[PDB]
Amino acid sequence: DGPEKNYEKTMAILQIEAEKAELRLKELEVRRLMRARGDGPWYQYPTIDKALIDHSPKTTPDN
Amino acid sequence: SWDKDVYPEPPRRTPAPAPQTSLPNPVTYLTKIFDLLVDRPVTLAREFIEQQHAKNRYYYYHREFRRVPDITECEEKDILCMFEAEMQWRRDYKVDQEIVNIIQERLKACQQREGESYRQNCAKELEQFTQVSKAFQDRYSDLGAHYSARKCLAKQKQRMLAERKAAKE
């Protein structure tokens, strides 16, 4: 084929691979920050559910 | 066929035949025999083949690439611009190699043609080759087997820094 076909295919491939590399670095930074802070949807280790607490009159008045 | 400006040839100064002896020069007879037994059939064959070529006359073109922004006008991670600039730089590298090749062809032709007076009569060709060689060595040298446009840019920046340091001293 023409020399321009390989040129444009190479440009598309380079764009895709550069986007992949940037996304990989972004993902690594995001994962590190989420693990360090725990303020995102990832690394949300479970805690005690507050629906188990019994909010009813107990025996002793001081609860 | 080739542009004589690109490949300069000095005007041909051929001495006239001025024989003094009456002996038959065998060279002339041999040349006539050659021109009768080889040149004539070869010329006839070339005439036939050129007629056949002229019967079917088609063309081929020299592809021209437009100028593209260099690596200097290229963002840090702009892969598309970097690719374009790198391809243009590689094309320019090939063109400069061929320029050096043309200059070397000129030098070799001058050296052979001038005979025993080549040293004095090819000083201009030697000077041209020296200029082109120094320019090429400044631009494309010590880059390595993994050369790139970014590496020439770095070498040029280093050279310009050295020039500034020399100028400020």
Nearest to B99 by CA among B140, B70, B63: B140
Method: cryo-EM
Q: Measured between CA atoms, how close is B83 to chain A, in angstroms?
A: 7
Query: Which residue bears the tokens 């043609």?
Result: B113
CA distances from residue B3 to B63, B110, B112 in whole angstroms, order as listed: 19, 17, 20
Name, in order, each residue with C-beta under 8 angstroms of B140's C-beta and a sequence gap of 6 or more.
Answer: B93, B96, B97, B147, B152
Question: Is B83 close to A18, i.e. CB distance below 8 A?
Answer: no
Give the span between the Cα atoms of A34 and A38, in whole angstroms: 5
Name, in order, each residue with C-beta under 8 angstroms of B138's C-beta and a sequence gap of 6 or more.
Answer: B159
- Count Cα atoms within 13 angstroms, Cβ side, for B124: 7
Name, in order, each residue with C-beta under 8 angstroms of B10's C-beta and a sequence gap of 6 or more.
Answer: B113
Q: Testing the interface with A: which of B62, B79, B80 to mutate, by most A Cβ within 10 A?
A: B79
The two counts, helices (H) then strands (E), for chain A are 1, 0
Give the span between the Cα atoms of B114 and B168, in whole angstroms: 46
CA distances from residue B146 to B73, B105, B142 in whole angstroms, order as listed: 22, 28, 10
Q: What are the structure tokens assigned to B12, written together? A: 């041909």
Give the span between the Cα atoms of A46 and A38, in whole angstroms: 11
Burial of B48 (0-12, 13-18, 19+ CB in 10 A): exposed
- Given CA atoms B103, B104, B109, B111 in this order, what sign does their dihedral have? positive
Exposure string over B144-167, b if 16+ CB within 10 A, otherwise e:
eeebbbebbbebeeeeeeeeeeee
Q: What are the structure tokens assigned to B58, written together? A: 């088609």
Q: At what angle do helices B123-139 and B79-113 cross, to 10 degrees?
A: 160
Give the span between the Cα atoms of B1 and B63, in whole angstroms: 20
CB of B155 within 8 A of CB of B142? yes
Q: By the CB < 8 Å criterion, does A23 face chain B? A: no
Q: What's the distance, Cα to Cα, between the start and end of chain B in Å?
A: 53
Strand, helix or coil for residue B124: helix
* Residue in B63, B77, B83 closest to A11 by CB: B83
Nearest to B124 by CA among B140, B109, B146, B139: B109
Measured CA angle at B72 (ends B71, B77), to 5 deg = 60
